[PDB]
Structure 1
Amino acid sequence: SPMYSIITPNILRLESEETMVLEAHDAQGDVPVTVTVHDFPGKKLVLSSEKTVLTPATNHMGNVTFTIPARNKFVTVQATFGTQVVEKVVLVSLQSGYLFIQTDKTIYTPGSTVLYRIFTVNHKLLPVGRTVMVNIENPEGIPVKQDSLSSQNQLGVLPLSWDIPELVNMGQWKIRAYYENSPQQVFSTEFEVKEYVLPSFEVIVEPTEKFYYIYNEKGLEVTITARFLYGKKVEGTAFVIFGIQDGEQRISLPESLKRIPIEDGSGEVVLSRKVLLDGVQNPRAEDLVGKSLYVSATVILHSGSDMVQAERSGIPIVTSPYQIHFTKTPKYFKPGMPFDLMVFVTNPDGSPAYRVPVAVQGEDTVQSLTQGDGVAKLSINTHPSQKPLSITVRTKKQELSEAEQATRTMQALPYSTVGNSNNYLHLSVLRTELRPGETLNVNFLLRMDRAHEAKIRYYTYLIMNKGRLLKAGRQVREPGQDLVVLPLSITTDFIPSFRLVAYYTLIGASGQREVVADSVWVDVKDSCVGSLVVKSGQSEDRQPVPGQQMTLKIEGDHGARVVLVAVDKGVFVLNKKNKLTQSKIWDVVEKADIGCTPGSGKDYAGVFSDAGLTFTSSSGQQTAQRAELQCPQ
C-alpha cells in the first residue's frame, strides 16, 4: 500500500497559476506524476503540461503549477502516479479578479464632469490586462452611459470621464463595472449629484462616548466643533436637535432642540436622559436597547454669510460598553483535545476594544486580555464526549458591574473520526498581532494511543491565501513528540490573512486507511504590500500661498504608476461617503475567500473543504464535491 494524494483549491481560476500538491505516502523511490486538466464532461485537455517526479529526497512531496485557459463550469483534474491514477472534479470560476473604482469627488453639480478611474487586478491584487464594461446608472437605476474598454498595456489603470448634463436627476448615482468574462460579478461606487456650493468651514459633532448607556443619567453629552477649512477656529451660533433611529425609521425629539453659542470654535450640548424617555416613551427604558441615536447640528457664522449642517448618527443604545464575537472561532472541537476560542471583543460601534479581560462561565480565575485587534484567546479542555460543547464568555472589566458586562454563547460539535479511531490533530498558534517580517510558531498537537503514535513521522501543511495555495511543506515528527513546532515565516505574501491546514495519514483500525486533519485561520495586520507616502518635498519653511508653486514628495514602489488627485476639503463637508481606501480593498479581498469556516470541520473531509481545499487519494478518501460558487448561508 502506497497512497497517492492530490490537493488543490475548492475553486480553480482561469488564466491564473494554481498549484497542485502531489504526495506519495508509504512509497519507495522515484515516482513520476503527470498531471492533467480536462473539460467536464468529456475530453479536451485544457492543460496537459506539468509533469514531475517525487523523490525520497523530497520525502515524496511536489508542486506543479498549471494554468487553465481561457450553469457552472467544471474541469477534471487527473494526476497519474506511475500506473495508479487519481482524479477529482473541481469547480471553476470565470472571475478574472477584482475591480476598484475611484471618483475624483464624492459629490458633483449638474454640468460638471465626473472623473473616475478603474483599477483592474487579478485575485492576488496584481494589475492585469482585460476588457471591462462600465455603466453610469442614474439614481433610479437607469444605465445612461457605457464604455467598453480594455486595460491591456494600460498597466491596471483605466482613466475615464463622463459629463453630467445640466438637466439631470439629483441624488445618488452609481458606477457599475464588470469584466467582459464575469458579467455576473459586478463592482460599484456611488456618488451624489446635487446643487450646492462648498461651505467655508467644517462642523464636527462627537458624543463623549461612542454610545449611550440607558442608565447613564448624565444623558448623552456632545461636543460641537467648527473650524474654517484653513485652520482658524470658528465663531458662531449653533442649533442641535436629537432623534432616534430604528431601524431605518427616524423620530426627531423636538423637545431636545437647543441653541448654543460656538466660541473659540466650540460649543457644548446635552440630551438629558429625561427628555429622551419622555420623547420616545415606550413602556420601559430597556425597550430602547438595540436602537441608535443621532445628533443633528446646524451652525451659523455670526456674519450670517455662511452656514453649515452636519450629523453624527448611529450612536447605539446599550446595556453594555462591549459586544462579544465567536465569528473568529472554529465551531468544531476535538474531544480530549483542548478547544481554543478566539474571542473578539468590540465596542458598540464596531471598533475592536483593547485590553479587555474576558473569562468563561464562572471562571473562576482563567481570564485573558483582549489584544490590539480586539482578540483574546481562551483555551478550555475537552473530554471523550461527543455531546455538543456550549461555552459562554463574559467580559470581566473591572470598574463595571455584572449588569454592564457583555456576554455571548456559542457551540461546537465534535470532529468525527474514521470508525472512532480517537485520533485527532490540533493546531494552536499564539494570538498576538502579526506583521510581515515576523515569524510565527505553529504548534502541532497530536492525539492518539501510544500503540500507534510511532507511525506518524510527519505532517503535511498547506498555507491558503487569497483563495490560492501559497505554500505547502512537510513538518517532521519523531515518535513520542506530542507537540512539534513549525516556525512559519510571515512575508508580505500573507496579507491580509491566511489559513493553515495540516494533515497526517496512516493505516490503522483494521488495516484501514485514515486521513486526519485540522486547520486554523490567522490574521495578518492589514496594510499595503508595497508602500505609498505623499509628503511635502518643500524641505522646511512655512505655509504656501494661492497660485504658488509647491513641491510634492512621493515615496512608493519602484516602477509603479502613481495616480493623484486633489480635493477641496470643503467637498467632504457635503459628502464624505464612498471614498477609496486600502482597507475597503482588503475587505473586498477577504469577502472573496473560498474559505468559509474559521477552522476545522465535521470530519477530515470537512476541515479541507471549509478551508477551501479539495483532497483526493488512491484509496478513495476525499472531500465532498464543491459545486457552489460562494460560501453557504
Structure 2
Amino acid sequence: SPMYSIITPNILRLESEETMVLEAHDAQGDVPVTVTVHDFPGKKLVLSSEKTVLTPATNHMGNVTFTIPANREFKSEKGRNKFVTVQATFGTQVVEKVVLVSLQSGYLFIQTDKTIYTPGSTVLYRIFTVNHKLLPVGRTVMVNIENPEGIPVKQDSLSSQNQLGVLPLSWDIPELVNMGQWKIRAYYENSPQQVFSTEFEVKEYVLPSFEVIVEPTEKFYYIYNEKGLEVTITARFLYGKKVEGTAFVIFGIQDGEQRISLPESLKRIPIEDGSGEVVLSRKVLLDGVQNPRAEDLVGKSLYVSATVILHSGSDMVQAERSGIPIVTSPYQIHFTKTPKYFKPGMPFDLMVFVTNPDGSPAYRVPVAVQGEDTVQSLTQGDGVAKLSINTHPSQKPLSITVRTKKQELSEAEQATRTMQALPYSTVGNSNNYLHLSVLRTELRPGETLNVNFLLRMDRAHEAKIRYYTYLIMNKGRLLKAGRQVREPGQDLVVLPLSITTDFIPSFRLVAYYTLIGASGQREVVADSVWVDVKDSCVGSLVVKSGQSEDRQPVPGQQMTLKIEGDHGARVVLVAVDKGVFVLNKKNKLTQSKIWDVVEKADIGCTPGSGKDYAGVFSDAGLTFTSSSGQQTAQRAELQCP
C-alpha cells in the first residue's frame, strides 16, 4: 500500500503562517486530503480548513498554509506545556500526530536614543514589533519601566495597528529619583510570560570632552612570557584631534566576582601625540598575589583602569578594559558546529571553531588532525576551518582530536581538544546510508550552491529509488520544498540551489528518500546539514552625506544626507553625541544582536545528522508521520538540553 507522509514543524506558533508539507509515495491518481487541527485534550475544532487535492503530475506534492487562532483556552494556562493534534484524512486513510505549541508570537526590539539619562530629563524609546518572519505586525504591546530595586513605576497599553510596526513613546524621569540600573520591559498580550527587556542607567554625569581606548597588543597574557603584559593608551578628542596630557594606569587581577588590586603596578606615563605605553613586569604580577605558583593564575583575568587628565587640568575620564584572559595557550578549539554523528565508510566533515581566548573568532591559523597530519587547513574570515577525514566502514566509534599547528610556537602552546562521534544507525541493520556533502563558505544571498546527494546502497536496490525529497528550514519554519529526480544508475545527483535574501542567517537543509527493503518492511533514511549565510540586512539601507565638499561643517551650517533604502519602507532616525557612548557603550542595538536573537529562538540545536532518522528529524526541528506507522520521536520540552 502507498504510504502517506506529513511533515510539520516540531514547534507551532500562535498567530503565524505555518506550513505543513503533504507528500505521498507510490500514490495512484488524485488523492484529496483535508487537514484538521484539534486541541489536546478534547476536541475544540480550532481549525479544519485549507484542504488540498493531490496530482500525479506534480509528483503528489502539496503544502497547506493556515494560522492557528489565538483563543482564551490557550491563554488560560501559561505555566504548563500544551499540545494540539493535527489530523489528515488521506481519502480512506487517517493519520494524526500530536505536536507541542509554544506561546512565542514575535519579537520586541527596544531602541533608546541615549544610554545614560540625568534626572529631570526626558526618555524617548521606540518599540519595534516584528513577527517570527521578521515582518511588521499589528498586535498589542504592554510596556513597563522598572527601577533597579524592582518596582514598576509606569505602565502603558499600546497598539501597533496602523503604525507599521513602530511605536514611539516618551517618559519623563522625576527630578528626584534613585539612581542605578533602570530597566524597560515589554511583553506581548498573548504571552505575558515572555518578557523582553533593555537596560539604561541614570547617572549624575556631565559629558566628557574626549575618548580613551586602552588596546593591549594581544588580547591575552602568556603566563611564561618574561616581558609581561603591555597596554597602549590612545587618547583622542571626540572631534578627531590628538591629546596632550598625563595618564594613570593600575592593573588588577579579576578572579570570579572579586577584584584584587596591585598597588605596585601604578605608573604615571606621560601620553604624547595621543599615544603612550606602560609595561607590567611579570615579577610584580607574581608577587602581588599571595600564591607564587604559576598554574593557579590560569583561568583568572586582568583589567586595566586607565585615568587620563589633560595638561590644563580641566576634565578627567576613567576608561576601563576588563576580561583579558590568562591562558597558557594563545588559541581555543570549539566543536559547537561539528556534527556529532558521522556515516561509516563515508567522508566526514569537521568544522572547527578556532577562536581567540577572549571569544572573538581567529583568522588564518593552521589546524590539523593528530593522526595522518598531512591534512591541513586555514581558518577563513569567520573563524571556521574546513576539514575532511576518510572514515573506515566500521561500526566502532571513531575518536578525533585536533591541534593547531602554527609555527614559531612550541608543542605546549598549541591548543588541543578531543571529540567522540557516534556512527549513524540504520533500521534493521540494512546498511542504507545517505550523506549530503555541501560547501560551507562565507555564502551570500544570490550566489549559487551545489548540494551533493551521495546515495550509498547495494545494486539490488539501486533502481527502486527514483527521486529525493528535500526541505529548507529558516527562522523555525519551512521555506521551500521540492523533488529532485534521480534516474537509476546515477550514483551522484547535484541539486542547484538559489540562495536569495530570504535565507538569512542559517538555513538547515534535510533530505530523505524511501523504498521497501528487508522482507517487506517499509523504512525511511534521512539526513540533515547545517549551513551558514552572511549576516546582513534583508534589505539594504545606507546613510551617506550628499554634500561632498565643505569639509568639517561649521556648527549651524546645514548638510543634506541621503537615505538609500528599499522603496515603500519606513525609516526612523536618531542622532547621538559620541560623549554618551564614551561614558557608556553597552546595551545598544545592531544587526548582530538581532540575528543572535533570531538564531537563539530556533527550534533545533544539533548541527546536522543524528542517531537515526527519527533523531535526525527531531534534531532538525521537524516531526515526520507516515500512514504505515513510521514516526519520529516525541518532543515535550521548549528548550533543548
For normalisation by structure 1, the TM-score amounts to 0.97
**1:181 matches 2:190:** yes
Match of 1:455 in 2: 464
Question: 2: distance between equivalents of 1:117 and 1:357?
Answer: 46
CA shift, 1:53, in A, is 2.3
Q: Say whether 1:437 aligns with 2:437.
A: no
Tell me by how many angstroms 1:189 deviates.
0.9
Greater shift after overlay, 155-164 or 275-284?
275-284
Deviation at 1:364, TM superposition (A): 2.2
| 2:286 and 2:292 in contact (8 A); partners too | no
Compute the displacement of 1:49 (Å).
1.8
Moved more, 517-526 or 386-395: 386-395
CA distance in 2, matches of 1:556, 1:543: 26
How far is 1:5 from its partner?
0.2
Quick check: 1:117–1:158 contact (8 Å CA) kept in 2?
yes
Structure 1 residue 269 corresponds to structure 2 residue 278: yes
Structure 1 residues 12 and 291 mapped into 2: Cα distance closer, same or farther (>3 Å)? Answer: same
- Kindly indicate whether the alpha-carbon contact (under 8 Å) linking 1:334 and 1:415 is maintained by their aligned counterparts in 2: yes
Q: Distance in 1 between matches of 2:153 and 2:132?
A: 30
- Asked whether the equivalents of residues 440 and 532 of structure 2 are also in contact (C-alpha less than 8 Å), the reply is no
Judge conservation of contact 2:94–2:627 (CA < 8 Å) in 1.
yes
Residue correspondences, number: 632
More divergent stretch after superposition (292-301 vs 276-285): 276-285
CA contact (8 A) 2:232 2:276 kept: yes
Alignment partner, residue 76 of structure 2:
none
- Equivalent residue for 2:525? 516
Q: Deviations over 1:312-363 (max 9, x none)?
A: 1111112222111110011112222222111111111222212222111233
**How far is 1:475 from its partner?**
1.8
1:84-123: CA deviation from partner (whole Å, max 9, x where unpaired): 1111111112211100101111111111112111100001
Moved more, 469-478 or 429-438: 469-478
The 10-residue stretch of structure 1 (461-470 or 227-236) with the greater mean CA deviation from structure 2: 227-236
Which stretch of the first structure deviates more once superposed, 382-391 or 218-227? Answer: 382-391
Superposed, which structure 2 residues align to 1:39-438 within 5 Å?
A: 39-70=39-70, 71-438=80-447
CA contact (8 A) 2:354 2:379 kept: yes
SS at match of 2:283: helix
Alpha-carbon distance in 2 for matches of 1:546, 1:139: 38
Q: Distance in 2 between matches of 1:131 and 1:592?
A: 21
Q: Is the 8 A contact 1:135 1:177 kept in 2?
A: yes
Q: Is the 8 A contact 2:329 2:414 kept in 1?
A: yes
Q: Deviations over 1:528-556 (max 9, x none)?
A: 00122111122322121222223221111
Aligned twin of 1:472: 481
Q: Deviations over 1:356-395 (max 9, x none)?
A: 2211123320112211211122122333433333211111
CA contact (8 A) 1:76 1:87 kept: yes
CA contact (8 A) 1:298 1:307 kept: yes
The answer as to whether partners of 1:429 and 1:441 remain within 8 angstroms in 2 is: yes
Q: Any idea what the Cα deviations from partners look like across 1:583-628, whole Å, max 9, x if unmatched?
A: 1000000000011111111110111111110100001111122222
Q: Specify the SS of the correspondent of 1:136.
A: strand
After superposing the two structures, state which structure 1 stretch, 180-189 or 32-41, moved more: 32-41
Deviation at 1:44, TM superposition (A): 2.8
Give the 3 Å change call, closer, same or farther, for CA 428–282 of structure 1 in structure 2. Answer: farther
Structure 1 residue 277: Cα displacement: 1.3
Post-superposition offset of 1:410: 1.4
**What does the per-residue CA deviation read over 1:1-45, in whole Å, with 9 as the maximum and x for residues that have no partner?**
201000010011122111111111112222212112122223233
Q: 1:96–1:123: 8 Å Cα contact kept in structure 2? A: yes
Q: CA deviation at 1:283?
A: 4.1
Corresponding residue for residue 564 of structure 2:
555
* Residues 386/143 of structure 1: CA separation in 2 closer, same or farther (3 Å cut): farther
Distance 2:327 2:389 in 1: 29
Give CA deviations for 1:434-471 in whole Å, capped at 9, x if unaligned.
Answer: 10011111111122222212222221111000001111
Deviates more, 1:149-158 or 1:372-381: 372-381
How far did residue 403 of structure 1 move?
1.4
3-state SS of the aligned residue for 2:125?
A: strand
SS at match of 1:258: coil
Deviation of 1:194 after TM superposition, in Å, equals 0.8
Tell me which moved more, 58-67 or 489-498.
58-67
Q: Secondary structure at the match of 2:582?
A: helix
Q: Answer whether contact 1:333 1:412 (CA < 8 A) is retained.
A: yes
Q: How many angstroms apart in 2 are the aligned matches of 1:451 and 1:608?
A: 27
CA distance in 1, matches of 2:404, 2:617: 33
Contact kept? 1:375, 1:431, Cα under 8 Å: no
CA distance in 1, matches of 2:328, 2:489: 51
Change (3 A) 1:565 1:69: same
State the Cα distance separating 1:560 from its structure 2 match.
1.2
Ranges in structure 1 where 5+ consecutive residues have no aligned partner: none
Matches of 2:486 and 2:359, distance apart in 1: 42
Distance of 1:534 and 1:246 partners within structure 2: 43
User: Bigger CA drift: 43-52 or 295-304?
Assistant: 43-52
Contact 2:13–2:101 (8 Å) recurs in 1: yes
1:166, distance to aligned residue in structure 2 (A): 1.7
Higher mean C-alpha deviation, range 312-321 or range 120-129: 312-321
1:536 is aligned to 2:516? no
The whole-number CA distance in structure 2 between the counterparts of 1:214 and 1:94 is 49
Query: What is the DSSP-based 3-state SS (H/G/I as helix, E as strand, rest coil) of the residue aligned with 1:190?
Result: strand
- CA deviation string 1:253-276 (max 9, x = no partner): 121111011111111112122211
Does structure 2 retain, via aligned residues, the 8 Å contact 1:376–1:431? no
Secondary structure of residue in 2 paired with 1:318: coil
**After alignment, is 473-482 or 423-432 more displaced?**
473-482
| Separation in 2, partners of 1:461, 1:32 | 23
Larger displacement relative to structure 2 (134-143 or 479-488) = 479-488
Q: Answer with 292-301 or 390-399: which moved more.
A: 390-399
- Hey, what does 2:27 align to over in structure 1? 27
Q: Is the 8 A contact 1:499 1:611 kept in 2?
A: yes
Alpha-carbon separation, structure 1, partners of 2:285 and 2:491? 60
TM-score, with normalisation over the residues of structure 2? Answer: 0.96
What SS does the aligned partner of 2:608 have?
Answer: coil
Moved more, 516-525 or 80-89: 80-89
Report % sequence identity: 100
Task: Rate the CA distance shift 1:444–1:248 in 2: closer, same or farther, 3 A.
Answer: same
